[PDB]
Design a binder for this molecule. Structure first.
Ligand SMILES: [Cl-]
Ligand SMILES: [Cl-]
Lengths: 56, 924
């Protein structure tokens, strides 16, 4: 049938980023590194007396 | 140090001085000499009298708790150790079990050996069991409250208070607390409501002493501002604060320094999970462990990981933390997998982690101090607030520095930046602990439960509340102040004129217009052409510090957008500088004067100096210029200017003549002229007022001034008193009852309904909304996974960036529930409750409905981590709360015979409770 809808109505824009749905995600654990490891320890590395104490 | 003891006694009580007490036997012995504060508190326990111990965490409060446990077990009694949060309970359970053997645990997450003589439980479980009226309480002789000062928490504080009030009078209490200033009140409150004595043992004792250091951002080292003797180093502090006013990678240098000077282990605190891992990332280039150490901890690590299946073992959260650990670097925050959180604690205690990046919560963990403690900052989000960390908080956290056996001292380093104000910084390192002020507030589950039970009432709870108690104490103190003010007022109410009123009005009006003139003439567009070398200027920085007349040396465009007045720096010579001001810290174009820089006062010596000011600090511009020295930095030249100033002041005793803004500075636009004319009108009008010439003046004026202040203080004081009345809370009560009536939870006669009874047994989510949901039937037609998902809307308490686009099988129940919430928020408003109806509805967070829904349908952990930005550990935390909630619903269904509901809720439990979510704890 027709692969579209007619829709002239507005929808309130989402308050937040749209999360991925179950369909978009597989069970490969190593993928977390890119998908969720941003700025985290498991992210992917670039590889791919005395008054004063000095730092010295 | 010194030990202070006091006791609060019931009326007509036969008291023998605690220090005379000689115990016949020691219910527990220790391999070290007791400290007197311990000895004393233990006598109290031997005598069967309650006691609040108030001491710092390294001081050995645990010795006292242990004694109470042993004595109870000895007397075949039962004892309860209440912890603030579940994580500490698990830790404490592990410690007590190994010691006393006869120990069990009851938390939101688990129950172990519930018949044991010694029960470790959270305040929340205690609360439930009391309202539940469990027979366990009958056998209980002693209840220990660990960290009772958490009773002052704005949202969770009420639980402590609530459960204390609820305890049987026969019970005795050991309260463990931080060093609080108002211990006496607490004791007395205990004394009144439970009709028994309550001792107080206080001490500032620290086994290992603290040194406090400031680290200014981009600086070169750290500055000792409080030494082991607790002496404040004013001079060094000043140096530190000036170093940042003149001015994420610093941390790396700091840790390296700590390593080089053998100050490890160090806990590096931050106040966000994110900050923690970032910081750890910088460290990893370094390596702090020997190959033997690496091997040892790897064994410990694997042994912990062993219970987990390979599929979980392969999560990069697990696989890629091990390389950090091996280098001696740890992370700790509520976002990690629980299993990692635990093993890291363990690896830390065994000394395998030399640097630990952690959020605040680690500070109250059990037996995990360090040699050094670093605050990367002292600002924390209260979700929607910006806290300068309290003094008390700074202390408690900084108290984690200094290891009793092994360290001469604890090292505390506070990193600071330009945002830091000196008074605040000074306040922290000289940390004074905060009062223990009740944060009591009425709650529906509370009220409902009180109504349900025969012998007690909401009105009772209020009456016995620490909150109300703190009122009945404070109010009379205030009425005494008021009366003293009132007496002074009614006595100072001797105004001879109302002409005074006119005088005041004119004076201030003039003052205001002259300021307008000031803004104009000091504006760079007007003033810079008249600030030639030697120009006489009258200085008043920040409008507070009056240096009198000085002389311009030079000026220049400020180089970092500021306001116009703030956009130029003028260097001036003053000869009124306080002799001991740290003029060595002054920098030639930093208008923010160092702490200590001030004018001299009546009986002090002065020195000459060159200070940088902005045009805001210029009060007037004179029509004179000194001849300036060619080299103001050459010996004696400042003092030479000073001499010339003295001569100028002597040649003009009644004020140095100023530039006429009109005739000299040529400021002649229309508005400026009528401004001068207004000033002109008022000055002659002023001269007409009889008082202006007369001798009364300050007498009549100061009198006029005093009454109004006094009137103000009174008005203000009358208000504080008004809001310290029991009726407030009583209003809150009647309102909330309306709600319960209107919703059908209780009768108009305040008799509980069937709906009230179920709400009684719900503590994990909003008991109103959940109850309504249940009785309207929303769960009737949902599959369990739907119910799970809907229920996640109550267990999820975290904030997140992503949100799912819900398909109808979740969007509809969500909608249906928001409708009921709405109806509820209606009725809330209907009863004059301070509730913002939209925020309520939205408080039930939905962002994990699809995560929970699919987890329940068999998605792997990996998949649901991909479906949200919420942290893995947080995810498991949410599931665990979700389980608890569900169990509570299983319970209520059971107790109202709704077999269908019960089975549904049970089914949900079976869907949730699996794999990584069902992983057990390293401690249990
Ligand atoms: Cl908790
Ligand atoms: Cl390695």
């Amino acid at each position: 049938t027709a692969p579209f809808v007619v829709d002239t109505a507005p929808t309130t824009p989402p308050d937040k980023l749209v999360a991925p749905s179950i369909e978009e995600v597989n069970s490969n654990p190593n993928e977390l590194r890119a998908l969720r490891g941003q700025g985290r320890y498991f992210g992917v590395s670039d590889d791919d007396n005395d008054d004063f104490i000095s730092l010295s | 140090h010194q030990v202070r003891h006091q006791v609060a006694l019931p009326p007509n009580y036969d008291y023998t001085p605690i220090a005379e007490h000689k115990r016949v036997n020691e219910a527990r012995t220790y391999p070290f000499t007791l400290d007197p504060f311990q000895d004393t508190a233990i006598s109290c326990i031997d005598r069967g009298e309650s006691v609040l111990v108030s001491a710092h965490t390294s001081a050995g409060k645990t010795v006292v708790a242990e004694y109470a446990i042993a004595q109870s077990l000895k007397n075949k009694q039962r004892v309860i150790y209440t912890s603030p949060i579940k994580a500490l309970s698990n830790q404490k359970y592990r410690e007590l079990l190994a010691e006393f053997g006869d120990v069990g645990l009851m938390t939101g997450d688990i129950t172990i050996n519930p018949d044991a003589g010694c029960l470790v439980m959270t305040t929340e479980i205690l609360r439930s069991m009391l309202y539940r009226g469990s027979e366990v309480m009958r056998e209980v002789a002693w209840v220990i409250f660990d960290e009772v000062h958490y009773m002052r928490d704005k949202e969770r504080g009420v639980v402590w208070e609530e459960t204390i009030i609820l305890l049987p009078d026969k019970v005795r209490y050991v309260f463990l607390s931080a060093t609080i200033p108002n211990a006496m009140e607490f004791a007395e409150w205990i004394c009144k409501i439970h009709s028994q004595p309550c001792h107080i043992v206080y001490t500032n004792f620290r086994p290992t002493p603290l040194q406090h250091y400031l680290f200014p951002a981009h600086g070169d080292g750290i500055y000792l501002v409080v030494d082991e003797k607790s002496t404040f180093r004013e001079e060094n502090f000043q140096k530190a604060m000036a170093s940042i006013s003149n001015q994420k990678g610093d941390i790396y240098k700091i840790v390296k320094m700590i390593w080089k000077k053998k100050y490890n282990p160090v806990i590096v605190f931050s106040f966000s999970k994110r900050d923690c891992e970032e910081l750890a990332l910088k460290m990893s280039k370094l390596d702090f462990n020997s190959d033997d150490e690496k091997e040892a901890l790897t064994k410990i690590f694997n042994n912990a990981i062993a219970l987990l299946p390979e599929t979980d073992r392969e999560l990069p959260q697990i696989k890629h933390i091990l390389p950090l650990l091996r280098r001696g670097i740890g992370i700790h925050h509520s976002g990690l997998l629980p299993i990692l959180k635990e093993v890291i604690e363990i690896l830390f205690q065994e000394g395998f982690l030399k640097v630990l990046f952690a959020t605040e919560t680690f500070s109250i963990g059990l037996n995990m101090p360090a040699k050094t403690v670093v605050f990367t900052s002292v600002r924390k989000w209260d979700g929607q607030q910006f806290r300068w960390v309290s003094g008390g908080e700074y202390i408690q956290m900084s108290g984690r520095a200094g290891r009793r056996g092994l360290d001469d001292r604890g090292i505390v380093i506070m990193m600071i930046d330009e945002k830091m104000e000196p008074q605040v910084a000074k306040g922290m390192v000289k940390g004074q602990a905060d009062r223990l002020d009740s944060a009591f507030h009425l709650g529906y589950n509370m009220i409902l439960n009180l109504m349900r039970v025969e012998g007690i009432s909401p009105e009772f709870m209020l009456e016995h509340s620490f909150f109300q108690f703190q009122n009945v104490i404070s109010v009379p103190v205030m009425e005494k102040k008021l009366a003293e003010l009132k007496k002074d007022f009614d006595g100072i109410e001797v105004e001879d004129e109302e002409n005074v009123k006119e005088y005041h009005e004119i004076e201030q009006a003039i003052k205001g217009y002259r300021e307008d003139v000031r803004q104009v003439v000091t504006h760079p567009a007007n003033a810079l052409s008249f600030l030639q070398p030697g120009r006489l200027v009258e200085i008043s920085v920040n409008g507070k510090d009056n240096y009198g007349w000085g002389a311009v040396v030079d000026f220049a465009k400020r180089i970092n957008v500021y306001t116009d007045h703030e956009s130029y720096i003028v260097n001036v010579v003053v000869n009124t500088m306080y002799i001991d001001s740290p003029v060595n810290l002054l920098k030639p174009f930093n208008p923010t004067l160092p702490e200590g820089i001030r004018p001299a006062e009546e009986g002090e010596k002065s020195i000459c100096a060159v200070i940088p000011i902005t045009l805001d600090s210029i009060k007037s511009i004179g029509n004179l210029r000194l001849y300036m020295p060619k080299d103001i930095r050459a010996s004696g030249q400042k003092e030479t200017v000073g001499k010339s100033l003295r001569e100028v002041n002597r040649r003009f005793p009644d004020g140095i003549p100023v530039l006429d803004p009109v005739k000299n500075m040529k400021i002649e636009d229309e508005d400026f002229l009528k401004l001068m004319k207004k000033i002109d009108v008022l000055n002659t009008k002023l001269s007409s007022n009889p008082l202006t010439n007369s001798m009364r003046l300050e007498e009549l004026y100061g009198k006029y001034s005093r009454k109004h202040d006094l009137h103000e203080d009174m008005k203000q004081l009358k208000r504080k008193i008004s809001e310290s009345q029991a009726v407030i809370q009583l209003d809150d009560l009647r309102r909330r009852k309306r709600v319960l009536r209107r919703l059908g939870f209780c009768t108009p006669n305040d008799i509980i309904e069937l709906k009230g009874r179920v709400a009684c047994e719900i503590s994990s989510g909003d008991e109103l909304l959940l109850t309504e949901l249940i009785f309207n039937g929303n769960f009737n037609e949902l599959k369990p996974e739907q119910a799970a998902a809907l229920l996640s809307c109550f267990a999820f308490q975290e904030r997140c960036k992503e949100a799912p686009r819900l398909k109808p099988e979740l969007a509809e129940p969500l909608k249906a529930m928001r409708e009921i919430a709405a109806k509820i928020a209606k009725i809330m408003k209907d009863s004059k409750i301070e509730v913002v109806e939209k925020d309520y509805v939205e408080s039930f967070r939905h962002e994990l409905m699809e995560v929970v829904y699919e987890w329940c349908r068999g998605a792997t952990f990996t998949q649901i981590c991909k479906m949200t930005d919420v942290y893995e550990g947080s995810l498991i935390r949410m599931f665990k709360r979700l389980e608890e909630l569900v169990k509570e619903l299983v319970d209520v269904a059971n107790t109202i015979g709704n077999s269908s509901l019960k089975e549904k809720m049970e089914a949900v439990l079976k869907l949730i409770h699996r794999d990584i979510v069902s992983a057990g704890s390293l401690y249990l």
